[PDB]
Amino acid sequence: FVIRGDEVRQIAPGQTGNIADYNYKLPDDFTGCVIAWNSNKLDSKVSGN
Amino acid sequence: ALGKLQDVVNHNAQALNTLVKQLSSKFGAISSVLNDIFSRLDPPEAEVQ
Numbered sequence: 428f429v430i431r432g433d434e435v436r437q438i439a440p441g442q443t444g445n446i447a448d449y450n451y452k453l454p455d456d457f458t459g460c461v462i463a464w465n466s467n468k469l470d471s472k473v474s475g476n
Numbered sequence: 477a478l479g480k481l482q483d484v485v486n487h488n489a490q491a492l493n494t495l496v497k498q499l500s501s502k503f504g505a506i507s508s509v510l511n512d513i514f515s516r517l518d519p520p521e522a523e524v525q
Contacts, residue, residue, distance in 0.1 A: 440518075
């Protein structure tokens with residue numbers, strides 16, 4: 428999925444926020460890895476994607 | 477006259493009071509209140525705390 432850049436820290440266990448509460452929640456004991464990187468040239472057009 | 481009986485009771489009461497009063501020491505942690513720890517420390521950190 429894709430989110431805003433300022434919410435990359437929000438994707439983590441023991442987090443609090445909008446997308447955590449109302450878009451996607453991770454478990455506290457989550458084991459694994461997370462990758463996030465600007466997709467401007469992919470999911471950002473000047474007209475707004 | 478009979479301090480040799482009284483000292484036993486003194487030692488036991490003193491030991492119990494020390495034991496209960498030890499409930500307030502933080503052991504260097506955030507607090508000695510489990511609810512306070514759970515509230516302030518995110519679950520990942522709260523586990524170790």
